[PDB]
C-alpha cells in the first residue's frame, strides 16, 4: 500500500487558480509529512511546501509563500494544493511526496526524505485556446533507406499521440518532443525510416490523436510527384 494518486492534468489561464489533489491509498495518512514538489518542463525539482495533518502544521517555501495554500483532509485521506495568481512560468508537473519511515507507530521514525511519490499532475498555464492540430505530410524525398513523416502543427494543449499504420509500424519510428511556438501553440514532428523499394507500393498513414480537443486525424504520406 501507501500509494499516492494525484488528480488529472490541468489547463488554466493566467491569473486563475488551480487545485491539485493527492489521495493517499492504504497505510496511514495522518502521521507523516506530505510535501509538494514541482518539476518545470526540462528543468529540475523544486520543493514548494509540506504538511503534517496530525499536528496541523504547514511549511511553505519563500518563493511560493503568499501565493500557495497546502491543506489536509484527514476525513478522506486527501491532501490538497491550491495555486493562485497563475502565470505561464507556473507551467509544470506537480508531485506530491510523503516522507518514508523505518517501522510503524511509536516503533521507528520518519526519514524526512521523500520515499513515496504520486504520478504527478501537469499544470498548463496559457491564454491560448483548445485547438485541434493541422497535419502536414513530410514527403519522402524523390532522390537503401528513405525517411518520411507527418508534421503536427498548431495545437493546444499537450499532448499529441502519433501511431503509424494503426500501430503496425513501430521500429524506426521517432516522435519528437513538441515545441511551444511564439504564437502560443504547440507543434511536434513524427518520422519513420522505411526501405525505398517499398515507397511506391506501400501505403503509409500516420494516425494523429489529440484527446484534449477530441480530434482524430489520419494522414497518408505519399511521395511528391513532379
Amino acid at each position: 500500500q501507501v500509494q499516492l494518486v494525484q488528480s488529472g492534468a490541468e489547463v488554466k489561464r493566467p491569473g486563475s487558480s488551480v487545485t491539485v489533489s493527492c489521495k493517499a491509498s492504504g497505510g496511514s495518512f495522518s502521521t507523516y509529512a506530505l510535501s509538494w514538489v514541482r518539476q518545470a518542463p526540462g528543468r529540475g525539482l523544486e520543493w514548494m511546501g509540506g504538511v503534517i495533518p496530525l499536528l496541523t502544521i504547514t511549511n511553505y517555501a519563500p518563493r511560493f509563500q503568499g501565493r500557495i495554500t497546502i491543506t489536509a483532509d484527514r476525513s478522506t485521506s486527501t491532501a490538497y494544493l491550491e495555486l493562485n495568481s497563475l502565470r505561464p512560468e507556473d507551467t509544470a508537473v506537480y508531485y506530491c511526496a510523503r516522507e518514508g519511515t523505518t517501522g510503524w507507530g511509536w516503533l521507528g521514525k520518519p526519514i524526512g526524505a521523500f520515499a513515496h511519490w504520486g504520478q504527478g499532475t501537469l499544470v498548463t498555464v496559457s491564454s491560448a485556446s483548445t485547438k485541434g492540430p493541422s497535419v502536414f505530410p513530410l514527403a519522402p524525398s524523390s532522390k537503401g533507406t528513405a525517411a518520411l513523416g507527418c508534421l503536427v502543427k498548431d495545437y493546444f494543449p499537450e499532448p499529441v499521440t502519433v501511431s503509424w499504420n494503426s500501430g503496425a509500424l513501430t521500429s524506426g519510428v521517432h516522435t519528437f518532443p513538441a515545441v511551444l511556438q511564439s504564437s502560443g501553440l504547440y507543434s511536434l514532428s513524427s518520422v519513420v525510416t522505411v526501405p525505398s523499394s517499398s515507397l511506391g507500393t506501400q501505403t503509409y498513414i500516420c494516425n494523429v490523436n489529440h484527446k484534449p480537443s477530441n480530434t482524430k486525424v489520419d494522414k497518408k504520406v505519399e511521395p511528391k510527384s513532379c
Binding site: 510535501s35 520543493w47 517555501a61 521523500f114 504527478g120 493541422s134 508534421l151
Partner: protein, 214 residues
C-alpha cells in the same frame, strides 16, 4: 539558502562500469540530511539514498552514498541498463528544502554519424500562408550536434526551433528535428533552402538542400 551543485552535468559510461556522482553544498548540511534520487523520463523521482548513506529496502546493493559535511558522493558499482537516468541530490536538514540541478547518466557508445534528411513544406501548408522546412538528423551519437539554416547561402537566426529525442533504449543514439518557419511570401522570395549539420562523426559538415518548386 543551501545551494546544491552536482558534478558533472552529463556522464557517459558503458553498461558495467562504475559511476561516481558529486554533490556539494554552499554551507553545511545539518544532521547529514542528504538524500539521493533517481528519475527515468516520464516517471516520478525515486529514493535511493537517505541520511547520506542509508539505503531503503528494495534498493539494489550496487547503490551507495558517502560523504559528510559539504561534499557527498553517490556511487553505482556496476551500471545495469536500468540505471541510466537523471540523479538528484537533496538536503532536508533545514526548514526550506532544496535540490541539486541533477546529473544525467547516459550510455557511452561508438561514435555514429547522423543521417540527414530535409523536407520541403507541403502545398497544403503553403496555401495556409505558412512554410515549414524540416531538417531531420537520424540516429547519432553523441548528443552534441550543430544545425545551420542557409537560405540562398545566407545564415538564419531566430526563426528555427529544434527538439531532441531521449537516448534510444536499444541503440543508445539521439535524433534531432529542426524546423525553419517562414511566411508564404518570404518563402517564395528565395530559391535554395539548405541545412548544414556539424557532428563528431562527420569529418566534413554535411549539407542537404532543395530548390523551391523544383
Amino acid at each position: 539558502e543551501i545551494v546544491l551543485t552536482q558534478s558533472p552535468g552529463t556522464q557517459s559510461l558503458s553498461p558495467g562500469e562504475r559511476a561516481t556522482l558529486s554533490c556539494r553544498a554552499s554551507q553545511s548540511v545539518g544532521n547529514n540530511k542528504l538524500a539521493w534520487y533517481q528519475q527515468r523520463p516520464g516517471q516520478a523521482p525515486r529514493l535511493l539514498i537517505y541520511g547520506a548513506s542509508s539505503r531503503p529496502s528494495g534498493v539494489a546493493d550496487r547503490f551507495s552514498g558517502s560523504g559528510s559535511g559539504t561534499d557527498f558522493t553517490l556511487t553505482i558499482s556496476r551500471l545495469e541498463p536500468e540505471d541510466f537516468a537523471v540523479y538528484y541530490c537533496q538536503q532536508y536538514g533545514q526548514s526550506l528544502s532544496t535540490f541539486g540541478q541533477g546529473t544525467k547518466v547516459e550510455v557511452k557508445r561508438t561514435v555514429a554519424a547522423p543521417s540527414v534528411f530535409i523536407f520541403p513544406p507541403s502545398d497544403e501548408q503553403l496555401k495556409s500562408g505558412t512554410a515549414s522546412v524540416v531538417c531531420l538528423l537520424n540516429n547519432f551519437y553523441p548528443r552534441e550536434a550543430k544545425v545551420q539554416w542557409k537560405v540562398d547561402n545566407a545564415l538564419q537566426s531566430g526563426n528555427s526551433q529544434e527538439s531532441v529525442t531521449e537516448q534510444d533504449s536499444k541503440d543508445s543514439t539521439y535524433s534531432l528535428s529542426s524546423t525553419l518557419t517562414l511566411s508564404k511570401a518570404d518563402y517564395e522570395k528565395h530559391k535554395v533552402y539548405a541545412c548544414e549539420v556539424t557532428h563528431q562523426g562527420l569529418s566534413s559538415p554535411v549539407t542537404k538542400s532543395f530548390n523551391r518548386g523544383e
